[PDB]
Amino acid sequence: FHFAADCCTSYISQSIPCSLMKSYFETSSECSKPGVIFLTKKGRQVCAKPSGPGVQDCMKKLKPY
Amino acid sequence: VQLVESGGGLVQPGGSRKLSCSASGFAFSSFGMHWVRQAPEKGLEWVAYISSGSGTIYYADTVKGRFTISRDDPKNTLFLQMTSLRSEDTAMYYCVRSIYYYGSSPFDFWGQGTTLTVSGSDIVMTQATSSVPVTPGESVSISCRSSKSLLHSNGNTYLYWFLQRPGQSPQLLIYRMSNLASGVPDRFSGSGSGTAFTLTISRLEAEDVGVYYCMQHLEYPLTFGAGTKLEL
Amino acid sequence: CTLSAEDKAAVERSKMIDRNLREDGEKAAREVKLLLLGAGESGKNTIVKQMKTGIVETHFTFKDLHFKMFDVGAQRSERKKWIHCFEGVTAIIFCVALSDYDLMNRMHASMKLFDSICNNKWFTDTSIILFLNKKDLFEEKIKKSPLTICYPEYAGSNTYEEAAAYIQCQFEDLNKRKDTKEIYTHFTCSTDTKNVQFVFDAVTDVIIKNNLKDCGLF
Amino acid sequence: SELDQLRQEAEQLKNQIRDARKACADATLSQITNNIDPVGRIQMRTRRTLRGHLAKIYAMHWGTDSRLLVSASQDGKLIIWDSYTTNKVHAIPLRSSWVMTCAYAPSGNYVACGGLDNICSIYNLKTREGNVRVSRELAGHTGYLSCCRFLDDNQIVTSSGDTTCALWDIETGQQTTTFTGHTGDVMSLSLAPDTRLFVSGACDASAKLWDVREGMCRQTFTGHESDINAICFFPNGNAFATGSDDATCRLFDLRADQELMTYSHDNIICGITSVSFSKSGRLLLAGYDDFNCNVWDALKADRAGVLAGHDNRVSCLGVTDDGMAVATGSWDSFLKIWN
Amino acid sequence: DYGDATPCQKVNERAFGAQLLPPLYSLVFVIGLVGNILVVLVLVQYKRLKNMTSIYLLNLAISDLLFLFTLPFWIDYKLKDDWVFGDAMCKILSGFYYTGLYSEIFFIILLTIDRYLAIVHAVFALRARTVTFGVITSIIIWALAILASMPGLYFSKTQWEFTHHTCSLHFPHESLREWKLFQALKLNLFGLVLPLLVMIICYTGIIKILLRRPNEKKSKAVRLIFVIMIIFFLFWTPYNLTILISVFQDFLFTHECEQSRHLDLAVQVTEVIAYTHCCVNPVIYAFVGERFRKYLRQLFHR
Amino acid sequence: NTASIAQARKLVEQLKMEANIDRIKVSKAAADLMAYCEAHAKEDPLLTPVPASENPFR
Ligand SMILES: CC(C)CCC[C@@H](C)[C@H]1CC[C@H]2[C@@H]3CC=C4C[C@@H](O)CC[C@]4(C)[C@H]3CC[C@]12C
C-alpha cells in the first residue's frame, strides 16, 4: 500500500565508527537506491551503503540486542 | 440370451491363460459380470466381479494379484487374464451375468463354462448335509446356515439358491429369500430367519434332482455353500 | 455407509443414468427448436420441402447448426391446451399466403391466427419469422383483382412492391410487444434457395440476443 | 320441423333432470359436516427431491407398491424412480418428446406414455434382455393423448383431445370400445377402485361417468364455468372431485347426482392442474399454477394446508396407494415427496 | 564526526496519509464487500443457469474479496503506524494482495473474451462456452495469478524501525532496481497493455455487431461498453504511470525527497482509485444486467 | 339437416336414459361420505402422521 518508508538520498563518505551507533536498518525497497540507517547515542540517524567498509562487519557486530 | 466361454485346456504351472466370454442376446453393457469356478469335485467358488461400466472390480483373496478381469463392451466380450497358474486353479469356469437395481434378480443367467487343467472375516455358509435320498412326489426341505445374519436394515435377506443339474450349469431358483426366479416352477419355495434358511420343494419331479447351493450377497467376497445333492 | 453390496451397485447404476441424462441434455441444449405454424393450404409444405397423425418433426443441419422444426398442423384440437408445450421454442415460423387475399376472408383468417399467436402470453419474448408465400401468383392476380376487396382503406396502385409492403406492414402492426420481440419478414416464392439462409440469419440474431441477455449487456 | 321439435324435447328433458336434482337436494354437505371437528393445520415437509429431468415435468404416476414412480418430462424421457433411496431405476428414451401423460401398470410390468403424437406407447419393464422395450404403440386417436390408465396388463383406457375416450386391448392393439359424448377436448381420466366405472372431465366444463363394459355414458355432471383439467374418485368410488381453470374444485356425488361441495378462495385466481385424495378421503390435494399445492378439508371446504416449494406451476400430483407420502411434479423440473 | 547525510523524514506525508487513507479505505472496503457478497449470493443460488460467464463472474468476485480481505490490516497499520502482526502475516497479506490484483485483471480479460466469443461467434460458442472449459481456464488463471505473486511472497519482511514496526518488501541488494522494474513491468504489461488490448479488440467487434439493426437496447449496451472501457482505463492507468515514475525516481527528480515526497503522496492517492475499481467492478459486470437484477429481486422477495 | 336430425336423436336418446336414474337424497350421500371418512381416519398417514421410525421417508 506504499507506506512511503523513510529513505536515504546521501551517504556518509567516511568509514563508520559505530561505537557511536546503537542500531542499524536496511531501507525498504520503495527507495530508488538501497541504503542503511544508523541510529546514534546522540540520536541523529545517518545513511551508508550496503557495500560500505564498516557497515557490514559492524551490523554483524551490532545485531538485534 | 447366451454366454459362451472360450479358452481353457491344458496349461503348465506358473503359466498364463486368457478366458473369453462372448455375450449375445441381451444388453451386455447394462449388466455386471462375475467369474465363478467349480473344482473337478468340489462346489462353486466366486472368483471375480466387474460392474456395469467397469467402475468397480472385486477379486477373491485367493486370486488377487494373479488374475485380472476386463470387459470390451463394444465387442460384447468379457476377459480373464490369469498368471502364475497353480494346481488349485484346475476348474470349470462359469461366466455369470448380474444386474442390480430395486427389484432385479442377480445371478440369473450362467454360461456353459470352460475347463482349465493345470499340470478370516469371510461369511462362511454351511449346508450340514451332502446327500438326501428322495422319491418323486414327496416334499423336501434343504437347509443352509450363515455365520452372521444375512438380514439387513433394508429388510432384505441376501440369500440366493441355485440348482446344478448333472452335466449342466447352475440355475437361479430363489434370489432374495422367498422371491422365486423367472421360469422356475412354483414347487420351489424359500423361507428363513436371519441365519437359518430353508428351501422347500413340493411334488418333487425327476427333473429336480441335482445339487443345491446357498449363496450370500451381503458383501464381498461372495460365498457359496458346500451343496446338497438329491438322489433317485 | 450402511449400504448393501446390491444397494451400492444400484447407486452406481443410478449415477450412470445421471451421466447419460446429462449428456442428452447437453446435446439438446445445442439444438435450435422451431415452431412451424400457419393456416392450411399455404406454403408451409413448400417451406418444409425447401428446408430438407399428430406433430410432425423435421431435422436439418445448416452451417454447423442443427435445426428441429415442429409442424403442429393436423392437430385439430383446442390450441390453448398444448401451445404452452412450445414455450421455450427459439423462433416461430409463420406461413401466410399472399394469394389468399381474394379468396370470411382467408387472409383475415391468417391475420386472426397471427394476432392470436404473436400476442400469446407463452410467446411474449419469442421471435417470429414470417414467410409470405406464393408471391408469383400474387403478382399475377394483383392485376385482375385489386387489394381493396381485402382492404377497404387501401389507397395504392396495383403494383407488387406497394401492395406487398402494405401486407407486410399490416401484419407487423399486429405486434403489441414491439420492444420485446422481433418479426422477421421474408418474401419467398415456390422456387427459392435462400429461405434456409434467412431462417439461419434470424436464428443467429435470436441467439445473439439471448447471449446478450446472458452476458449482462442486456 | 323435426329438428326444432327435437331441440324442444332436449330442453324439457334437461328441465326434468334439473327438477329431479333439485328435489334430491334436501340438505347440503356443509350443513351435515358442521358438527365435524376440523383437521387443523397440516404441515408437510419435503423429504425427497428428485433431480435429473432437464425440462418441464408433465405427468407422474405412483406404483402400487408405493416405492417406484414413473415421471414424464418434455426432455423426451421417462424416469422410473426409487422414492426411498432417490436412485433412478430406469431411464426410457421416448420416440416423441411431447409427452403429456404417463401411467404405471398396477402389476408393475408396464408403463404407458403418450402426448402430441396421438399414440399411446406401452413399454415393457421386465424383459429377458435386461432393457426396456416398446411393447406396443396404440394408434387410432386423432387428437393428442391427455391421460391413460391401465385396468390390467392387457387393457388400457385413454382420453384424447379428439373429444373421445377409448378402451384398448393391448395384445391386438385395437380399440374394443369408444366413448363419445363430450363436445370438447377430454383432459383427464380417473378409474373407479373396482374399475367397473370411470369418470372423465373435458373442456366443455363437463364430467361424464362411463360404464367400461357396456361402453355408454351413465351420468353427466355440470357446474364448472371453464375447462376441467383434473378429476379423481373418492376412495370408496361413490364421489369424485374435479378441478378446473376457473380456480375451483368441486366434489360431485354419483348416487345423489348433484354437485356436493365447492373448494375455492378469493386469494386463488389461477387454474387447477391436478387433484388427488388421501386414503381416508378427508383431504383433497390440488396443484395450482400459483406454483404451490393446497390441502383442503374435503368435508368442510376449509383450506387445511399449503405445499409450497416449487419454482413453477405444479403440473401433477400423486398420493401413494398406502397413503404415506405425496409427490408433486412441476415445470421447474423437479419432483418432491412430502410427509 | 559523521554529520553529513540524513534521511528525509517524510513526517507530513505520514500525517496527511493518516488523514486520507484510513477513512477512504474504510468506505472502499465496506462497499466492495457489500457489492461482492451480494454477487456471490445471487450466483451459487440458481445452480442451474450457470455457464462460463457465471464461472468467470464468480471467480472475479472471489478475487475482489481476496483483495478486500487485506485492507482492514492496512487501515490498522496506517492508523497505528505500527505493524502489530507477525512476519508470516506479512507473507500471507502480500501474497493475497498481489494475487487479488492479478486474478482480478485476468478474470476481467476472461469475461471480455467470453462476451466476444458469445456475441461474435454465437454459433461456435454453442460448443465452446461450457462449464468444464470455464473451470479449466479458471484454474489456469488462478495458477498464473499465484505464480505472479511469488516475489511478494518470498521477499516480504518485517523490521523494527525505531519505536515502530514496518512491513515492506525488502528486495535483495545490487538488484533492487532490476527487481523493481520487473515488478512494475508485470503490472504494466499484464495489467494495462494486455487488458486494454483485449478489451479494444473484442469490443470493436461487439460494437460492430450491435450497431447493425439498431434498437434501444442495442444503443444502451453500446454506451455501457464505452462506459466499461473508460472506467477501466481512467482507474488503472495513473497507477501504472506512478509505479514507473517511482521506479526511476532518482534520475527524473533533480531535488530528491523534496519532490519525491509529493511523488509518494501521488502514489498513495492513485492507489486509492485503483483499489476503488474493485468496488466499481461488481456493478459493471453484474448489476447492469437484467438477469442478475431479476435474481437479486427474487432473493429479496424470499 | 339429416345429420343434425341424427345428432339430435342421439342427444335425446341419451337425455332419456340419463333422466331415468334412481337418485338418492343428498343428505344420505353426504352422511355416507362422512361415515367413510370417519371409518378410515386412523389409517391415513397424511392426516394422522406416524412416528418417524415407521415413516419410510424419514
Ligand atoms: C491465495 C490463495 C490462498 C487462494 C487461491 C485461490 C484458489 C486456490 C481457490 C480460491 C478460489 C477457488 C475457486 C472458487 C470458485 C470456483 C468455481 C467452481 O465452479 C470451480 C472451482 C473454483 C474455480 C474454485 C477452485 C479453488 C479456488 C481456485
Residue numbers in the entry:
A (entry chain L): 26 to 90
B (entry chain S): 2 to 120, 135 to 247
C (entry chain A): 3 to 54, 182 to 232, 240 to 354
D (entry chain B): 2 to 340
E (entry chain R): 17 to 318
F (entry chain G): 5 to 62
Relevant lines from the article:
CCR1 is widely expressed in various immune cells, and the knockdown of CCR1 has proved effective in suppressing the maturation and migration of immune cells, thus being regarded as an attractive drug target for the treatment of many autoimmune and allergic diseases, such as asthma. CCL15 is an endogenous ligand of CCR1 at which the N-terminal signal peptide is cleaved up on its secretion to extracellular media. In this work, we identified and characterized different N-terminal truncations of endogenous chemokine CCL15 as balanced or biased agonists targeting CCR1, and presented three cryogenic-electron microscopy structures of the CCR1–Gi complex in the ligand-free form or bound to different CCL15 truncations with a resolution of 2.6–2.9 Å, illustrating the structural basis of natural biased signaling that initiates an inflammation response.
The CCL15L-bound CCR1 structure shows that the CCL15L is stably anchored in the extracellular half of the receptor 7TM domain and inserts deeply into the helical bundle. The most N-terminal residue of CCL15L, F26, faced toward the minor pocket formed by L872.57, W902.60, Y1133.32 and Y2917.43. The backbone amide of H27 formed a hydrogen bond with E2877.39 (superscripts indicate the Ballesteros–Weinstein numbering scheme), consistent with the fact that the critical role of residue E2877.39, which is found in 74% of chemokine receptors and is crucial for chemokine-induced activity in many chemokine receptors. CRS1.5 was also observed in the CCL15L–CCR1 complex, with hydrogen bonds forming between C24NT and CCL15. Furthermore, additional interactions were observed between CCL15L and CCR1, where β1-β2 strands and the 30s loop (residue 50FETSSECS57) of CCL15L were found to interact with ECLs 2–3, and with TMs 5–6 of CCR1. On the binding of the CCL15L into the 7TM pocket of CCR1, the aromatic group of CCL15 F26 formed strong interactions with W902.60 and Y2917.43. Hence, the resulting steric hindrance pushed the side chain of W902.60 and Y2917.43 to sway from their original positions by 46° and 70°, respectively, thereby breaking the Y2917.43–W902.60–T862.56 polar network.
